[PDB]
């Protein structure tokens, strides 16, 4: 992944500007930067944004249902639903405003079943979101019709990467705003024998995004110097001076997981992620991960190969998954 | 011995929002609670057309908040801890929809600042109020805005008002299943103040403390209303082989005090429903303090030792929870 070494600073937030109604809002279908195309029948994802924000939702679209786990850190988690069964999962911008692009999604899908409300036919959509509003200088949020829109635009087997639906205003680094650049959404996709890996992101951390060599590749960029530093740094001396003597994403597979395995599976690409995103589950954060399978295929009875007595299981396709979500996470960044 | 208020055989589907041209209603219930508590209003709104409301708690200054959620059909958004409003809706997940259109006016109202110390916290839970009617409207983000705009300080709608309109009780089998309602409850102690908002749809029966099961499980076919346990073992016996709440006061708590306090209280309220906390609920308790008064350093009375700290707040809360529970059931 060819990260682009040049700065995308945000520049300075002014914490607010006009909001929804001062705008005749059409949504825009995100096409970002690139596309990335996948085989994974069942799973389909729009982007849809507004160009006055720019703010946007990303809507991962699951029609079957599909069992899932939650995995949220931080002090500033934005979530609706957090259901242990979706039939979407809806990131967006907009903070806490923007878990409306959720019921936009729920409501259609009610549509969409003939108003049907049994129990058992209840259309379930997780929505998590990003603090966004630093990044731009309006209070837009993504609302009932821009989730409505990212559904209607939901397609089968593609990804619109970088500025394109949550992603649109997201970015990294947020030791001081001057230094904070926009980031993207990202995404990658592995088959391996059969399986299945989709990993989404949308990172719009404090921290910022790391390579697998460990150069900061984005965030955190000190117009002063050309260069990004890890934050550490910036807080080693904060603290020598001072003291002296929210990234939202989405694992998808089709490999069957009881809950307890579900769970345990999230917690670790989850945390996984502190490799790609330092720091990462800080109290500053909003981190949420849905893990979610599709029940499609199973792991075999024992967990035997000739790469070892222990290498067919949860723990092996969580660290498959986990690179995977390196890989969308880098391509968010890009 | 109330008289019944069977909901009636559940149809599960009927016309939803898009057929109607909904008009908020102010809720008024069968009678209004009236208290003293400042910082505090509610609001409640509901659609005819449903019948199916939305109630919220506006606290405008924000206030510190737990949340307790039990069971495994929650249906919760936001679950800050800090709230400018707390929106109880019924719908099911439809319903959080409701919490959006308080979360959208509060932002107007703050003038579309978006600081991170700014933003307008809103909580919201529901409902699975479907069984109970023959139509699919849900609470809509504009029921919530209205029911914000209906909020007042100091009054509490009761009974079928707000989130209580199509609430039910008592889910062993739907022919036995009662209407509820919304409850409120207030007490004052010195400066202290609690005041209780529940709206109990449970799996359960509402039961008083003298143990009597006071709604929900009726038999029409009796005439007398039955604790869901006497059906369960005689279930088992031939065969082998949610309640959303608020208890809002004005001590000052710590987050951990705050967060035992929430639940406490919560499980208390399996006293007043049986069962509680049944994989069959979603069963979401908010504790909320304004903050504004302290308990004392040393916990002792007169009437002992260890009796004035947050497990005797809770203690009164619980009680105060019950009689909320008790108005909804009426």
Redesign the interface.
Same mark, same amino acid.
């Given at each position: 992944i060819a990260v682009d070494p040049a700065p995308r600073l945000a520049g300075p937030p002014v $914490?607010?500007?006009?909001?929804?109604d001062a705008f005749d809002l059409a949504p825009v279908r995100s096409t970002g930067r690139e596309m990335l195309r996948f085989d994974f029948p069942g799973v389909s994802i729009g982007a849809a944004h507004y160009e006055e924000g720019p703010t946007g939702a990303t809507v991962i679209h699951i029609p079957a249902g599909a069992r899932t786990a939650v995995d949220a850190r931080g002090g %500033?988690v !934005?979530? &609706? !639903?957090? @259901? *242990?069964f979706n039939h979407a999962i809806c990131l967006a911008g907009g %903070?806490?405003?923007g878990?409306?692009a959720g %019921?936009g999604v &729920? !409501?259609a899908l009610?549509?969409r079943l003939? @108003?049907?409300?049994? $129990?058992a036919?209840?259309?379930?959509?997780s &929505?998590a979101v990003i @603090?966004d509003?630093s990044a731009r200088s309006t209070?837009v @949020?993504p *609302?009932?019709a821009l989730g409505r829109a990212a559904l209607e635009f939901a397609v089968p087997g593609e990804f619109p990467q970088g500025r394109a639906g949550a992603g649109m205003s997201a970015s990294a680094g947020k030791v001081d705003w001057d230094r904070t650049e926009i980031t993207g959404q990202g995404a990658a996709f592995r088959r391996l024998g059969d399986v299945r890996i989709l990993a989404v992101v949308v990172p719009n951390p404090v921290g910022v995004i790391v390579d697998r060599a460990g150069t900061v590749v984005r965030g955190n960029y000190d117009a002063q110097t050309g260069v990004r530093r890890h934050p550490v740094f910036d807080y080693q001396e904060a603290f020598a001076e001072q003291v002296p003597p929210c990234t939202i994403s989405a694992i998808v597979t089709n490999v069957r997981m009881s809950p307890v395995e579900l769970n345990q599976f999230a917690k670790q690409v989850h945390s996984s992620m502190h490799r790609g995103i330092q720091p990462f589950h800080t109290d500053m954060d909003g981190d949420t991960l849905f893990a979610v399978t599709t029940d499609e295929i199973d792991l075999p009875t024992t967990p035997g190969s000739s790469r070892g007595r222990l290498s067919v299981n949860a723990t092996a396709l969580g660290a498959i998954a986990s690179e995977v979500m390196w890989d969308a996470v880098l391509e968010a960044g890009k």
């Open positions: $914490f607010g500007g006009p909001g929804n %500033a !934005g979530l &609706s !639903g957090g @259901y *242990d %903070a806490g405003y878990l409306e %019921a &729920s !409501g009610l549509e003939e @108003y049907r409300t049994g $129990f036919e209840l259309q379930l959509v &929505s @603090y509003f209070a @949020y *609302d009932k």
